[PDB]
Amino acid sequence: GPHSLRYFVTAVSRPGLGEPRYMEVGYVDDTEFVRFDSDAENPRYEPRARWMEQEGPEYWERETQKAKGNEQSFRVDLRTLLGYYNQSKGGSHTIQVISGCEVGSDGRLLRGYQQYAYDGCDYIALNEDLKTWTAADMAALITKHKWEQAGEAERLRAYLEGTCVEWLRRYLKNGNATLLRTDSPKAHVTHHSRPEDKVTLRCWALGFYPADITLTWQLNGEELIQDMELVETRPAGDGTFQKWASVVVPLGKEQYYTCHVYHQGLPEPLTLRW
């Protein structure tokens, strides 16, 4: 299937407590593989996935140097936005960026992206064309014209279809044993009594990878997605994910309901009933 390389960067100021905290987290799908934290005892880019041990010392040296340049750059960014927005130097503010690319199973670029956010709201973003920008407000409009005159879109575009896609292939190659695997989910249902002759049925799905999965409760062959309660798929701390979906049914009629689980690791969807 398709794969992606994503980088989540966050810069947050803390007036009166020193420099802003700067962080970088990279993902090669749903698995964290690298990260940088300015709050570390000795800030440096470090592996977060075992297959990243395949990269030479130079890799970590280059990524660390770049991350450090980025930190200074974002420190200035926060100051700049204070002026764009005419804000006080005493409040904490946040800048968020997400950039990456996606490729099909053949490795060809499917899509590239880069969007900024200020204080939790959209700021500026690269359009799908990978040639122009879209500013959410007049502040982001100042940045748009700045990047336009500096030919930043060309630079970004070259990275997205260039370095981004190529290094994504290499990561998928080196960590194929990890990134290209499939862990079939293991499910089970729990039963909880309710004050009203009502029963709560919860379907649990664990130990699976990738993270994409579908859990839907049935009754008379009709999906009850409308009366379903769930939680977003979440990391289980070992590289796998888990999720659960529940439905409240009348006590005594729990046998008429079934939980259906779909996932790449399930040749045939799972069907569970209390």
């Binding site: 980025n70 500026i124 290094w167």
Partner: peptide, 8 residues
Amino acid sequence: RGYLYQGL
């Protein structure tokens, strides 16, 4: 491989 971001 991460990107070297541009100033706002």
